From a paper:
The enzyme responsible for removing O-GlcNAc from proteins is O-GlcNAcase (OGA),23 which is a member of glycoside hydrolase family 84 (GH84) of the CAZy classification system. Inhibitors of O-GlcNAc hydrolase (OGA), the enzyme that removes O-GlcNAc from proteins, lead to increased O-GlcNAc levels in cells and are seeing widespread adoption in the field as a research tool used in cells and in vivo. Structures of bacterial OGA homologues, in which the active site residues are completely conserved with hOGA,34,35 show a discretely sized pocket having a volume that nicely accommodates the propyl substituent of 15d. Structural data of inhibitors in complex with an hOGA homologue reveals the basis for variation in binding among these compounds.
To assess the structural basis for this stepped decrease in potency observed on going to the 2′-aminobutylthiazoline 15e, we determined the structure of Bacteroides thetaiotaomicron, a bacterial homolog (BtGH84) of hOGA, in complex with the parent 2′-aminothiazoline 11a, the tighter binding 2′-aminopropylenethiazoline 11b, and the butyl derivative 15e, which shows greatly diminished binding. In all three structures, the respective inhibitor binds in the active site in a conserved mode with an invariant hydrogen bond pattern for the aminothiazoline moiety. Propylene derivative 11b matches the size of the pocket, requiring only a minor adjustment of the C278 rotamer and showing favorable hydrophobic interactions with W337, T310, and Y282. Thus, the size of the pocket disfavors substituents longer than three carbon units in chain length, and those inhibitors having such larger groups induce unfavorable conformational changes within the active site. We also noted that the selectivity ratio for hOGA increases as the 2′-aminoalkyl chain length increases to the three-carbon propyl (15d) and propylene (11b) derivatives, but this trend reverses once the chain length increases further, as seen for the 2′-aminobutyl analogue (15e).
Numbering used by the authors: 4 to 14, 16 to 46, 51 to 649, 654 to 715
The structure:
């Protein structure tokens, strides 16, 4: 209804937008708010509309109703008068943003509102690894922040070469500089502080030469319009991690630059130890920063872990040490460590009562800018009014705002694209919770030979139908073309999941052998299509491919497919393959966890899925990979957790050529030097059983 929800709102009657109005204070009030107001409109005889900041003539009558907080405002609508009065210029702009949401069909509700943020700095840090947001995406983002009362945008793409090492020393070229100039201007028009960050720690020298280069870079950005600045020391090693040096540098920028210019706003640093588990208690890095860094300077913090939600105990832990309220860097929805997943679910987990305990709250988003508006909108609501923060309603409101013409379809898509999957940070999100109980019940019964509930079967049927509807509708949506460009690969994979799910359910209901077999063949072809999408879309270097509906739906479908094929093989004494993911290559083994470990293709690599359990490698047993063709080989790398095995390659499986594995901490490796390869074979040739841990088994070929 109103986002963010105001601190104070008074319920009844309806007032039409005055066809004739008298404007009071258009020449004294925030020009950015006036422009918004004249846009919403279209003389002295008419109804009075008072706009202005506390102190202006236009609103002196309502001085006692205007909240005495920065960015606060007072809004009133009744039959005779409209009041739009901020405590300051940004507060007046934020009054117009709320006013704009109130306007419906030219009709306004009779309301009185007192409002202001609970958290002083609220917004976004473009701080991820990956392709930095496009210029057109950044322009759209700033307008979005202004509409949602987010007042902070911290520019810091890790892979922008003029942000980080070594070319943080170099001024932006004319083209990029002109774009940053535009960004800064658009930010100002939308009441957003543009904070330009620099990331010099990996190669900074603690000498005068690098100090001066950093300040000269800051001066250039200031000439481009930048009035807020940040220095990042995250994700570095070496002398740059020295807290005393970091604090002296930031205090120098403060005293010789930030407090020398007339109009610099935020000065922010992010530390090397930026979460609790990365803090070494055997030293005292954080208390050195807390005590030496000038108190006006902000210190960023991601929580108890690199990826974590903010708790009351956690914020108190850090605050005691840095001697000031932490400026939260919240690592959601950033996906740069799970780049084959979209993270489109609700924003939750952050304590709603600790607004006084944080200096700021910013979200690190996905490199998918439009897709991140779901989380950004929700953080905007949370940060402005946490006590009233409504996780699910705000998620639904965000989707309806981003894609009104297809909000139900985006909800369906987002609901099943929210978990991260397994990852090194251990961070997960709920997903598909609506249908998860019916999936769990259906699969337990089916596996056990008990009757499943008809209602559960139909819930699954319904889900797959709605998934196909939503996929096809989103693909053709033209209301937010940039969004659809971002999600399309996942949309394609999402539809394929839904079609597969339908066909497996028909295998469950199947009543004759011929019909079952058509469905089985259809499922296999769909598996092959998902493999194709996984290999040709989103081919980034770290987590290539496209994964969707991974927490609940894909396991349901795969396990149901496997179970019904097992039942068919039993019933008809048949030997249908029950594999659930297409794999063009083959692998066979006499060792067994390995025999059932699936191969994977990632870029030009062919690898055995690593396991976690003990692999007992018997005396004579082996593992042999057979590729679907002859390829020029690059290397083989193995990791067993070696005077017992023998690595051989071949083009025909008859004539073999032994390859010698080189040993090292990084472990068993061997170059192939473009030799043709189709078969790789690893055979235990010693006499005692050798138990191992397959951490990796990877062949790389030239494509
Ligand atoms: C307060 C400092 C936090 N800085 C961080 N730098 C890194 C970010 O650039 C990543 O996007 C993020 C997710 O992979 O992990 C850490 S968090």
């Amino acid at each position: 209804s109103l986002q963010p929800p105001p601190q104070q709102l008074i319920v009844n009657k309806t007032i039409d937008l005055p066809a004739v109005y008298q404007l009071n204070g258009g020449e004294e009030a925030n020009p950015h708010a006036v422009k918004v107001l004249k846009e919403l409109l279209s003389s002295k005889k008419g109804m009075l509309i008072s706009i202005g900041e506390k102190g202006d003539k236009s609103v002196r009558k309502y001085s006692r109703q205007i909240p005495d907080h920065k960015e606060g405002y007072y809004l009133s609508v009744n039959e005779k008068e409209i009041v739009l009065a901020g405590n300051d210029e940004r507060g007046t702009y934020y009054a117009l943003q709320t006013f704009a949401q109130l306007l419906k069909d030219g009709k306004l509700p009779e309301v009185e509102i007192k409002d202001y943020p609970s958290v002083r700095y609220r917004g976004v840090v473009e701080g991820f690894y990956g392709t930095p947001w496009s210029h057109q995406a950044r322009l759209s983002q700033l307008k979005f922040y202004g509409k949602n009362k987010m007042n902070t945008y911290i520019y810091g793409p890790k892979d922008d070469p003029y942000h980080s090492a070594p070319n943080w020393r170099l001024p932006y070229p004319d083209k990029e500089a002109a774009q940053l100039q535009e960004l800064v201007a658009v930010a100002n028009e939308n009441e957003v502080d543009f904070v330009w960050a620099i990331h010099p720690g990996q190669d900074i020298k603690w000498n005068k030469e690098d100090r001066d280069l950093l300040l000269a870079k800051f001066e250039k950005m200031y000439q481009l319009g930048v009035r807020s600045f940040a220095v990042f020391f995250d994700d570095i090693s070496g002398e740059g991690t020295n807290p005393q040096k970091q604090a002296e540098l930031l205090n120098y920028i403060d005293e010789k630059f930030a407090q020398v210019k007339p109009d610099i706003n935020q000065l922010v640093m992010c530390p090397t130890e930026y979460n609790k588990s990365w803090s070494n208690p055997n030293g005292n890095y954080l208390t050195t920063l807390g005590d030496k860094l000038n108190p006006s300077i902000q210190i960023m913090w991601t929580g108890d872990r690199v990826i974590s939600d903010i708790t009351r105990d956690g914020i108190s832990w850090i605050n005691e040490r840095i001697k000031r309220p932490a400026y939260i860097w919240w690592n959601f929805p950033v996906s740069d460590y799970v780049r084959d997943h979209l993270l489109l679910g609700p924003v939750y987990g952050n304590d709603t009562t600790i607004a006084k305990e944080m200096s700021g709250f910013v979200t690190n988003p996905m490199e998918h800018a439009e897709s991140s508006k779901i989380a950004i909108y929700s953080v905007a609501s949370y940060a402005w009014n946490p006590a009233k923060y409504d996780t699910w309603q705000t998620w639904k409101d965000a989707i309806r705002t981003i894609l009104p013409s297809a909000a139900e379809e985006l909800e369906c898509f987002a609901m099943h694209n929210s978990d991260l999957g397994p990852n090194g940070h251990g961070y997960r999100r709920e997903e598909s919770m609506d249908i998860q109980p019916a999936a769990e019940r259906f699969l337990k019964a089916f596996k056990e030979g008990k009757n499943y509930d008809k209602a559960d079967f139909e819930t699954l049927q319904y889900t797959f139908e709605r998934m196909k509807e939503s996929a096809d509708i989103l693909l053709m949506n033209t209301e937010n073309k940039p969004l659809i460009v971002e999600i399309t690969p996942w949309v394609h994979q999402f539809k394929l999941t839904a079609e597969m799910g339908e066909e497996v359910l028909k295998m469950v209901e199947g009543r004759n052998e011929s019909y079952f077999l058509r469905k089985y063949n259809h499922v296999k072809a769909l598996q092959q299509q998902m493999f194709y999408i996984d290999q040709t879309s989103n081919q980034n270097p770290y987590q290539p491919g496209v994964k969707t509906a991974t927490r609940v739906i894909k396991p349901l479908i795969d396990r149901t497919f496997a179970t019904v094929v097992k039942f068919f093989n039993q019933k008809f004494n048949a030997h249908l393959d029950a594999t659930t993911d297409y794999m063009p290559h083959k692998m066979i083994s006499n060792v067994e966890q390995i025999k059932n470990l699936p191969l994977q293709v990632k870029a030009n690599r062919v690898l055995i899925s690593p396991a976690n359990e003990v692999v007992k490698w018997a005396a004579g047993n082996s593992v042999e990979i057979e590729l679907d063709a002859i390829y020029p080989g690059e290397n083989i790398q193995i990791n067993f957790g070696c005077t017992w095995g023998r690595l051989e390659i071949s083009t025909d499986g008859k004539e073999w050529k032994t390859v010698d594995l080189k040993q090292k901490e990084s472990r068993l490796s061997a170059g192939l030097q473009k030799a043709p390869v189709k078969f790789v074979r690893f055979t235990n040739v010693s006499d005692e059983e050798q138990q191992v841990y397959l951490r990796q088994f990877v062949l790389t070929i030239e494509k």
